[PDB]
Design a binder for this molecule. Sequence first.
Ligand SMILES: O=C(O)CNC(=O)C(=O)O
Ligand SMILES: [Mg+2]
Ligand code: NI
Ligand SMILES: [Zn+2]
Length: 331
Amino acid sequence: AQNPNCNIMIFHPTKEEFNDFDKYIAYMESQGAHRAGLAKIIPPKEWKARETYDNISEILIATPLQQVASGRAGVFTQYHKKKKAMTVGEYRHLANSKKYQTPPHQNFEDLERKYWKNRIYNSPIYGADISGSLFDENTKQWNLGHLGTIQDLLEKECGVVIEGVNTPYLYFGMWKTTFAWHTEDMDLYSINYLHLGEPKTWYVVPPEHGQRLERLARELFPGSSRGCGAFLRHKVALISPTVLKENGIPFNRITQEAGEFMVTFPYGYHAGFNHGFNCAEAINFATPRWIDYGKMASQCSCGEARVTFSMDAFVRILQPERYDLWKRGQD
Ligand SMILES: O=C(O)CNC(=O)C(=O)O
Ligand SMILES: [Mg+2]
Ligand code: NI
Ligand SMILES: [Zn+2]
């Protein structure tokens, strides 16, 4: 078995290897990359997502989210308070202000220490989940707005035509902006490109050990667990590496820099934080190997997780027994 310790693997495709996205994902899996839950892909040196980032300041962040924490430094939840709209140029200025800017630090490890020590005492503002793309239309390789759609994959594998669409999302971050422990909707893959700015640190649990993370989360967040049998779908809970290590949960960490892709694999729990002002683009995707994960994915039916239009068909076709109850949660 390849990669039996479930280490995060880093890939360096040539420009030739970067032509066929599906083929490269299947290659990475042949080497065991999915066992980690997360892989890094450094694009060939010849490739670029677009010519410059000089003209992005007028993008609107319609609903910036202030991420307010509750709990203790290593075990906390966050809620998202909606803020007034602002442009990307306005948000960048805010991120660079004395109140929100990255503190002085020695290296990524020192910054990680400072994040876990101090995150809960601040409420950074995240421009998350903005439909759109920063890939030039002429970028032909690994253009996250030109991928094969999940509805087309389900149709190709299973023969059933379904409604829905699959488009990318932009994320504008600042110091301490945080993504809570989660897997993707329907335990899909994700791919994330860091277009510009400061790094993003990731934590990930191997898919084969995901239920260990779930059991610890039920212990650490006991009221939330009673409320919902899949409360990590709410995307609000944080657990630090120190707490994970104290409780024997297998995980790995890596820092993504501008110009790099990350792929998350089906049922790979992940969480992380931004180092400073940045912009990322991400989208879900599927392969044949996903189908079985989609059939077994947990679901929130308490009503909190509230997701996209396109998840309906996935539930309806892959999980017809759950459909009724899940849809009650969505309506
Ligand atoms: O970058 C972020 O805030 C969160 N992104 C992801 O969870 C992802 O790409 O799957
Ligand atoms: Mg603009
Ligand atoms: Ni994710
Ligand atoms: Zn729920």
